[PDB]
Amino acid sequence: TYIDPETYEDPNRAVHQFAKELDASCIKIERVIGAGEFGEVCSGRLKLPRKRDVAVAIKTLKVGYTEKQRRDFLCEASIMGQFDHPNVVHLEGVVTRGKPVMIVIEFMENGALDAFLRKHDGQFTVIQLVGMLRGIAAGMRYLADMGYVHRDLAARNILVNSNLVCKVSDFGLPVRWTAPEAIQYRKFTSASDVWSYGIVMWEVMSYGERPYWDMSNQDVIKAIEEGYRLPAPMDCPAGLHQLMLDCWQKERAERPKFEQIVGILDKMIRNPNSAHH
Numbered sequence: 001t002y003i004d005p006e007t008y009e010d011p012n013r014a015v016h017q018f019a020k021e022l023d024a025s026c027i028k029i030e031r032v033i034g035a036g037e038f039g040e041v042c043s044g045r046l047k048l049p050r051k052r053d054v055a056v057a058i059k060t061l062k063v064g065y066t067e068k069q070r071r072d073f074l075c076e077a078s079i080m081g082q083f084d085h086p087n088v089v090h091l092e093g094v095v096t097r098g099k100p101v102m103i104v105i106e107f108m109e110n111g112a113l114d115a116f117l118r119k120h121d122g123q124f125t126v127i128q129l130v131g132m133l134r135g136i137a138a139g140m141r142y143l144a145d146m147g148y149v150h151r152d153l154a155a156r157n158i159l160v161n162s163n164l165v166c167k168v169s170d171f172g173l174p175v176r177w178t179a180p181e182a183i184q185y186r187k188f189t190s191a192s193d194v195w196s197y198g199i200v201m202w203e204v205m206s207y208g209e210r211p212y213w214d215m216s217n218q219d220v221i222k223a224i225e226e227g228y229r230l231p232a233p234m235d236c237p238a239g240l241h242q243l244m245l246d247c248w249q250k251e252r253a254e255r256p257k258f259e260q261i262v263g264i265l266d267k268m269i270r271n272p273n274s275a276h277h
Contacts, residue, residue: 002147005078011071015096018081019074022046022092024099029058033111037172038062038073046092046104055107056092060100070101076172077103083146087139089159089169108167110160113200117155118208124164126237127269132166133204134265139168140197141258144190151188153177153196155203175217180224181252191252197261198247205236224248237275240268 005014026047034041039060045053061073074094080103081091095102110116113132117124124132136158143150150157150168154177157170179195181187199211211230212220229248232241243264249255256264268275 002082005075011075011078012096014078015074015094017078019077019091019096019103020081020093021096022094022102022104024095024102027056027058027095027102027104028053033057036060038065038069043107054092055109056104057107059103059105061102063100065101072172073101074103076170079148079171080105083143083148085139085142087135087137087165087167088142089167105169107161108159108169109162110164112156113158113160113166114155114203114208116160116208117204121207124207126235126240126275127272128164129204130240130265130268130272130275132160132164133201134262134269135166136168136197136200137258137262137265139166140190140193141262143168144193144258149188149190150193150196151182153193153200155200155208158200176211176215176220179252180221180250183221187252189252190258191255194247194255194258194261195252197258198244199230201240201244201247202230202233205233205240207233209233237268237272239275239277 005011008014028044029042030044031042032040033043036059039062042058042060044056044058046056047053061070074096077091077094080089089108090106092104092106152170152174154174158166159169160166175183177196177199179192182192202211203209215223229245232238243261246256
């Protein structure tokens with residue numbers, strides 16, 4: 001059920017096809033909470049026909065844009081808007097023509113996962129962490145069987161809410177996240193995403209540590225070709241590191257599938273101590 005919008009003769013028919021246009025009147029900007037690649041990402045609320053008010057985040061497109069940057073920008077909203085699943089950020093709608101140009105997404109109060117973990121270092125138990133990864137897996141099983149390949153899967157592109165529910169984000173357009181076949185031959189697949197997931201798995205348990213630390217990309221690739229793989233972060237159960245290695249199998253077939261993953265991680269939250277097998 002996933003159509004690409006860059007398979008479109010108009011890119012701004014995809015936008016309106018999958019995204020609900022919103023009235024700016026109904027949108028409140030309150031704070032800044034980052035700079036997106038296109039325009040200040042702000043936090044705020046949106047007013048629906050009587051539902052208290054939704055807490056939303058607001059990607060802006062700054063003015064004096066190329067009619068292109070607008071297309072690029074909104075090709076995020078055209079994609080994100082086609083997915084409905086708990087562990088994939090909910091689109092609320094867009095502001096295309098008429099008013100300041102905006103993608104109104106659901107508010108994740110905790111921000112990107114890499115940052116949220118670096119700040120809460122050691123504060124989370126191994127069930128809770130397995131639970132956070134469990135969500136992203138759920139996220140990607142959905143996207144996967146929707147026919148979508150993320151390409152840029154990383155802990156900075158997962159977002160966390162008040163309830164520590166992680167959801168997949170960044171739907172637009174990163175060597176140490178990318179699989180060998182994808183780096184070398186652009187063979188981006190839901191297998192290459194599982195590799196990236198593996199790296200996310202390490203990022204989580206490490207609590208937001210940079211993959212491969214300060215190894216150059218050059219070093220990281222040679223490292224991987226020699227068969228180097230990352231080790232069990234402090235306190236990470238061995239079986240859980242093992243899953244990381246499966247995700248990092250060189251033969252992309254041999255990796256587990258996102259459904260297989262969700263499966264394994266569930267056992268571990270079910271019987272934790274088995275996570276050392």
